[PDB]
């Protein structure tokens, strides 16, 4: 428990030294800081996303790019919280109209051989996978509360800044106000929202074992 | 002839001239060029690089340039045949040969004016002695002995020119030269290592000789890269490092 945050404050510091130090190019020609420059050039345009590459992360610090393959959930958070502390010491002082620091959605690509939908055995639960396919559907974008704040009903006590977890998982509202049993409601005025879609991915046509209809995810 | 020392016999002659470099087409010769280049661009020596691929193209190339220049350098070509006839040069032209092919042709060894050889003679060479292969009744009585001499020559030739093989790579001779001058770097060491590894990859040398040469090169590798003993934490990450590995024989398994 107390070693949890003490590990994190040592991972969120080694994920920050990766963006801040990784270079490319040789010594004869000349170098190029690959991710500071993209952070700056994407922030100043108003985009807020970098595209980290897994081979680079592996070649810089070999342990991190393994955690990221095994526990991607609780480590993408540290990565996206270091991308926000680096995009702060690079673009500041922001000129006039913006002075609140945005949030950086760290995507990530790779150059590794793809699996297939028929090779998703349950031992791959919560591991980065990489599958090809064909989009078959597309929902309409919706909202998804990220940082939500509630309020009691009778005594009007507030308990704010509550953070939702990402993905498709809800939240369990308390029942112990400290007032009737479940006195808590959501305050619609104070809840930050982000978009979210929901696609449908069909497996490539030349990989069906040819007795049936292709499966999808 | 055989060049005894490379500093004062090969380099410091072409140091002030306009040389012409003929280059074969194999990784060994590429890596043997890329060091000589870097040794010429460091002392402002005008060269010229002609990539050849056979004997017809080498002859065609010698046709056109044979009057401007009067220095030449052949790299991994033209040490197993005779040179003063296929090209038919003039008298004041000089040729340097830095080839690996074996065995060196005979006349190219007893011709100490026009064809100098940068070949370290401590290789596996056993060249026949000079007069063994090169030049009234008593007239016939002795010319029969000269006929016996010719008959022995026809045999000792067949003894000497019957098996072909390869010696130490060019990219190691050039590196010895580049270390003599005290102007060696890592970039000139990696090309030595590659020009050696290539022979063993294409299976033209014996495992014994390969491990002997690796034993040689490891001293150089450690001389360069060990100077960073404990400062490997305050050396720039963007600066080449060569290391000795005892690693698998699988081809390209890291990609
Ligand atoms: Zn209450």
The minimum CA-CA distance between A27 and chain B, rounded to whole Å, is 7
B56-91 CB burial, b ≥16 within 10 A, e <16: eebeeebeeebeeebbbbbbbbbbeeebeeebebee
Q: Which residues of A touch B190 (CB under 8 A)?
A: none
* Backbone phi and psi for residue B149, each to the nearest 5 degrees, phi listed first: -60, -45
Q: Three-state secondary structure along chain A? A: CHHHHHHHHHHCCCCHHHHCCCEECCCCCCCEEHHHHHHHHHHCCCCCCCEEEHHHHHHHCCCHHHHHHHCCHHHHHHHHHHHHHHCHHHHCCCCCCCCCCCCCCCEEECCCCCCCHHHCCHHHCCCCCCCCCEEEEECCCEEEEEEEEEEECCCCCEEEEEECCCCCCCCCCCCCCCCCCCCEEEEEEEEEEEEECCEEEECCHHHCCCCCCCCEC
User: Residue B208 Cα, ligand 1 centroid: separation in angstroms?
Assistant: 87
How far is it, in rounded angstroms, from Cα A173 to Cα A168? 16
Measured CA to CA, the distance from residue A166 to residue A162 in angstroms comes to 13
Interface probe for A, chosen from B238, B240, B254, B255 (most Cβ of A below 10 Å), is B238
- Report the C-alpha gap between A165 and A137 in whole angstroms: 25
Residues B239, A26: C-beta atoms closer than 8 Å: no
The encoded tokens of residue A125 equal 């639960």
Structure tokens at A28: 């004869």
**Cα(A148)–Cα(A2) distance, rounded to whole angstroms?**
26
Q: How far apart are the first and last CA of chain B?
A: 47
Residue holding tokens 């591991």?
A127
Q: How far is the CA of A156 from the centre of ligand 1 (A)?
A: 6
Tokens 């040729």 sit on residue = B95
Minimal Cα–Cα distance from A26 to chain B, Å? 7
Interface mutation target, options A20, A22, A27, A59, chain B, most CBs of B under 10 Å:
A27
Q: Give strand ranges (E) for B46-198.
A: 49-51, 71-75, 94-97, 101-102, 115-117, 165-166
**Residue that is written with structure tokens 């990539």 in the block:** B51
Cα A189 to ligand 1 centroid, rounded to whole Å: 19
- Nearby residues of B68 by Cβ (< 8 Å), 6 or more positions away: B18
The residue whose two tokens read 């945005």 is A102
Choose among A113, A103, A112: nearest CA to A58.
Answer: A112
Q: Which residue of A has its CA nearest to B255?
A: A112
**Could you tell me the two tokens for A23?**
């270079």
Torsion of CA A117, A123, A127, A132, to 10 degrees: -10
Answer yes or no: are the C-beta atoms of A133 and A202 closer than 8 Å. yes
How many Å lie between the alpha carbon of B41 and the closest alpha carbon of chain A? Answer: 15
Torsion of CA B146, B147, B153, B156, to 10 degrees: -110
B141, two tokens: 């009585």
C-beta separation of B36 from B172 below 8 A = no
The residues on A that touch B, with CB distances below 8 Å, are: 23, 26-27, 31
Please tell me what resolution, in angstroms, this structure has.
6.8
Residues in Cβ contact with B177 at an 8 Å cutoff, skipping those fewer than 6 apart: B6, B7, B10, B11, B39
Which residues of B lie inside 8 Å of A (Cβ-Cβ)? 237-240
Run of H or E residues at B1:
none
């Amino acid at each position: 428990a107390d070693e949890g945050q003490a590990r994190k404050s040592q991972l969120q510091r080694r994920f920050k030294e990766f963006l801040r130090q990784y270079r490319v190019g040789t010594d004869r020609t000349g170098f190029t800081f690959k991710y500071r420059d993209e952070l700056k050039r994407h922030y100043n345009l108003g985009e807020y996303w970098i595209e980290v590459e897994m081979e680079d992360l592996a070649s810089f610090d070999e342990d991190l790019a393994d955690y990221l393959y095994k526990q991607p959930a609780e480590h993408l958070q540290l990565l996206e919280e270091a991308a926000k502390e680096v995009a702060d010491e690079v673009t500041r002082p922001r000129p006039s109209g913006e002075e609140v620091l945005q949030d950086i959605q760290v995507m990530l690509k790779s150059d590794a051989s793809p699996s297939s939908i028929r090779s998703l055995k349950s031992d791959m639960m919560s591991h980065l996978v990489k599958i090809p396919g064909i989009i078959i559907a597309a929902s309409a974008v919706r909202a998804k509360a990220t940082r939500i704040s509630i309020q009691c009903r009778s005594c009007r006590n507030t308990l704010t800044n509550i953070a939702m977890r990402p993905g498709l998982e809800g939240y369990a509202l308390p029942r112990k106000c400290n007032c009737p049993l479940d006195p808590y409601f959501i305050m619609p005025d104070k809840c930050k929202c982000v978009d979210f879609q929901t696609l449908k991915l069909q497996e490539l046509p030349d990989a069906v074992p040819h007795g049936e209809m292709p499966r999808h995810m | 002839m055989f060049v005894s020392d490379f500093r004062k016999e090969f380099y410091e002659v072409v140091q002030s001239q306009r040389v012409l470099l003929f280059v074969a087409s194999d990784v060994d010769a590429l890596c043997a060029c890329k060091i000589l280049q870097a040794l010429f661009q460091c002392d402002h020596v005008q060269y010229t690089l002609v990539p050849v691929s056979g004997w017809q193209e080498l002859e065609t190339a010698f046709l056109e340039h044979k009057e401007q220049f009067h220095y030449f350098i052949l790299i991994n070509c033209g040490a197993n045949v005779d040179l003063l006839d296929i090209l038919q040069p003039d008298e004041d032209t000089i040729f340097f040969v830095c080839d690996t092919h074996r065995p060196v042709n005979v006349v190219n060894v007893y011709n100490d004016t026009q064809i100098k050889l940068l070949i370290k003679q401590d290789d596996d060479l056993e060249v026949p002695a000079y007069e063994d292969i090169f030049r009234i009744v008593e007239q016939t009585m002795r010319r029969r002995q000269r006929r016996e001499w010719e008959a022995r020559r026809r045999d000792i030739l067949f003894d000497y020119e019957q098996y072909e093989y390869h010696g130490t790579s060019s990219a190691m001779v050039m590196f010895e030269l580049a270390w003599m001058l005290s102007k060696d770097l890592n970039d000139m060491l990696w090309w030595a290592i590659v020009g050696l590894t290539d022979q063993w990859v294409q299976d033209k040398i014996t495992q014994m000789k390969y491990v002997t040469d690796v034993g040689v090169l490891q001293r150089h590798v450690s001389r360069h890269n060990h100077r960073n003993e404990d400062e490997e934490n305050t050396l720039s990450v963007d600066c080449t490092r060569i290391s000795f590995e005892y690693d698998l024989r699988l081809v390209l398994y890291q990609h």
